[PDB]
Design a protein around this ligand. Structure first.
Ligand SMILES: *CC(=O)N1[C@@H]2CC[C@H]1CN(c1nc(OC[C@@]34CCCN3C[C@H](F)C4)nc3c(F)c(-c4cc(O)cc5ccc(F)c(C#C)c45)ncc13)C2
Ligand SMILES: Nc1nc2c(ncn2[C@@H]2O[C@H](COP(=O)(O)OP(=O)(O)O)[C@@H](O)[C@H]2O)c(=O)[nH]1
Ligand SMILES: [Mg+2]
Length: 169
């Protein structure tokens, strides 16, 4: 069975854990332990292919040990998540993309830009801003809500499709 290693990265509080738990459990958590970094497996069918998705939901101290470099280097594609009500989390996307490029030693790593919390009314990052950023990176952009499940399947499945396109060479 085909396995895909997905990694969810981004600032604290953008909804990485809520997105992961929505995908895996079809339920919205109002709180998820900020001390829990972990990987979950989910079997799905994407475009007729039965896959195993291994989803690493990242958390912990900001540290750049060689061990953590190798841990991140195992990821085959990355969801780079910001929240559309938090401009700082959007400005931090550059950082996460650069760190992925660094550990993967490539400018062509499967990535999807995810603007989460799209159910909230207090939007500070406009859609055009995010699509412009994603266009400049050459990656898809998807708006999601872990609360309503809007866009959640599409974000993770689009990442899988990006990994397949990379694997085809
Ligand atoms: C509370 C919590 O769980 N986290 C916080 C944000 C994400 C997690 C882990 N921590 C963390 N933070 C940052 O950047 C935080 C900012 C804001 C304040 C100072 N910095 C720099 C920017 F301004 C943002 N980055 C990381 C981080 F890069 C990694 C990590 C580490 C290594 O060695 C490789 C690597 C490769 C690819 C990656 F995507 C990431 C990531 C993420 C990598 N680990 C934790 C980070 C604080
Ligand atoms: N309204 C709304 N709240 C969300 C959404 N995603 C996450 N949250 C909330 O934002 C807070 C932080 O989410 P969390 O998953 O812990 O973010 P993480 O730090 O990136 O893992 C929690 O209270 C979640 O309930 C969303 O799409 N909409
Ligand atoms: Mg979390």
């Amino acid at each position: 069975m085909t396995e895909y290693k997905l990694v969810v990265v981004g600032a604290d509080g953008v909804g990485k854990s809520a997105l992961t738990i929505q995908l895996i459990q079809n339920h919205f958590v109002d709180e998820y332990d900020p001390t829990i970094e972990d990987s979950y497996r989910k079997q799905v069918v994407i475009d007729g292919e039965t896959c195993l998705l291994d989803i690493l939901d990242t958390a912990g101290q900001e540290e750049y040990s060689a061990m953590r470099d190798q841990y991140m280097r195992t990821g085959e594609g990355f969801l780079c998540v910001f929240a559309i009500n938090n401009t700082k989390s959007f400005e931090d996307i550059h950082h996460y993309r650069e760190q992925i490029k660094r550990v993967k030693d490539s400018e062509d790593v499967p990535m999807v830009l995810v603007g989460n919390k799209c159910d909230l009314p207090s939007r500070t990052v406009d859609t055009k801003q995010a699509q412009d950023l994603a266009r400049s990176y050459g990656i898809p952009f998807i708006e999601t809500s872990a609360k309503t499940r809007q866009g959640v399947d599409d974000a993770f499945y689009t990442l899988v499709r990006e990994i397949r396109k990379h694997k085809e060479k």
